C-alpha cells in the first residue's frame, strides 16, 4: 500500500492589502440645507 | 427577535442659524 508524500520545490510569496477605516462621515449634520 | 436598528444621534450642532 503506497502512500505518497509531496513537497513543493519553490514556495511562492503571498501579498495582501491593508485596507483601513476611512475618515468619519456622520449621518446628517443638523445645521444644513435641502 | 427581528433585527432592530441602532440609529444614533448624528452631527447635532446648531439651533439658531440656518446655512445659506
Amino acid at each position: 500500500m503506497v502512500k505518497l508524500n509531496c513537497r513543493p520545490l519553490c514556495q511562492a510569496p503571498t501579498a495582501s492589502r491593508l485596507v483601513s477605516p476611512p475618515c468619519f462621515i456622520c449621518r446628517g449634520v443638523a445645521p444644513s440645507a435641502p | 427577535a427581528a433585527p432592530s436598528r441602532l440609529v444614533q444621534p448624528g452631527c447635532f450642532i446648531c439651533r439658531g442659524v440656518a446655512v445659506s
Partner: protein, 205 residues
C-alpha cells in the same frame, strides 16, 4: 524504533483536535450531531448599524459611535457582561480617524493598547470577522459586505450553558489488535445549549 515518540504525538494531536472542535461546535453547531451553537440558533436580540452616504453611495459602515451604544445599552439588571470579537475588529476600532486626521483612541501613541479585562473585551480570533480575515472592510467603496457579524455581548455565565458528561478517554481497543499491530480508541461525550435568548445580543452591519 523511530526515536521520535509517535504515540505521545498522537494523544497530543487528539486532545488538541477536540479542543478546537468543541469550541467551534458550541458556536456554529448545526442541530443534529453537534450542539446547537448560539451563533446559528439566532435567539440573541440582534442590532444592525446604518449605512453612511459616501458622496451619495450609501456604503455599509461601522464607526466607533456604534460600538459605544452597543455596549452601554445592555441592561445592567442582567449583571456584568463581557464582549467577544475577532482581533482584526479590535484593530479596526484602534485605527479610526476623525475628519481632521487625528486618532480617536490614544491621541498619538503609535499604538492603542488599553486594559482589556477592564473593558470586558475577550478577543478570540475564530469567531467570524467582518474584515474577511483582513484586506476587506474600511473603504470608501468596494468593501464591507452588508449583513456580516462583528461582535457579541452577554452574561455568559447564564446566557449559554456547557454540558459535560464523560470527557476524553483513551484505551487499547482489545479486539482488532493483534500481537503485531495495536488499534487505539478514544472518545468523549459533551454538549451544549443556550440558556436565555433574552440575555445576549449581536451586532451586525
Amino acid at each position: 524504533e523511530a526515536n521520535y515518540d509517535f504515540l505521545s504525538f498522537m494523544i497530543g494531536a487528539a486532545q488538541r483536535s477536540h479542543r478546537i472542535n468543541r469550541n467551534q461546535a458550541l458556536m456554529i453547531g448545526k442541530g443534529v450531531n453537534e450542539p446547537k451553537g448560539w451563533l446559528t440558533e439566532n435567539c440573541f436580540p440582534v442590532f444592525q448599524t446604518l449605512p453612511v452616504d459616501v458622496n451619495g453611495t450609501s456604503t455599509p459602515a461601522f464607526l466607533a459611535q456604534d460600538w459605544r451604544r452597543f455596549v452601554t445599552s445592555f441592561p445592567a439588571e442582567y449583571g456584568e457582561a463581557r464582549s467577544v470579537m475577532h482581533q482584526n475588529v479590535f484593530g479596526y476600532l484602534a485605527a479610526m480617524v476623525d475628519a481632521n486626521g487625528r486618532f480617536l483612541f490614544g491621541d498619538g501613541d503609535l499604538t492603542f493598547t488599553p486594559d482589556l479585562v477592564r473593558e470586558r473585551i475577550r478577543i478570540s480570533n475564530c469567531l467570524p470577522d467582518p474584515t474577511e480575515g483582513n484586506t476587506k472592510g474600511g473603504t470608501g467603496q468596494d468593501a464591507f459586505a452588508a449583513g456580516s457579524f462583528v461582535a457579541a455581548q452577554a452574561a455568559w455565565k447564564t446566557a449559554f450553558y456547557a454540558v459535560e458528561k464523560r470527557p476524553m478517554f483513551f484505551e487499547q481497543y482489545e479486539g482488532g489488535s493483534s500481537a503485531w499491530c495495536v488499534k487505539y480508541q478514544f472518545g468523549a461525550e459533551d454538549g451544549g445549549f443556550v440558556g436565555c435568548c433574552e440575555h445576549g445580543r449581536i451586532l451586525q452591519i
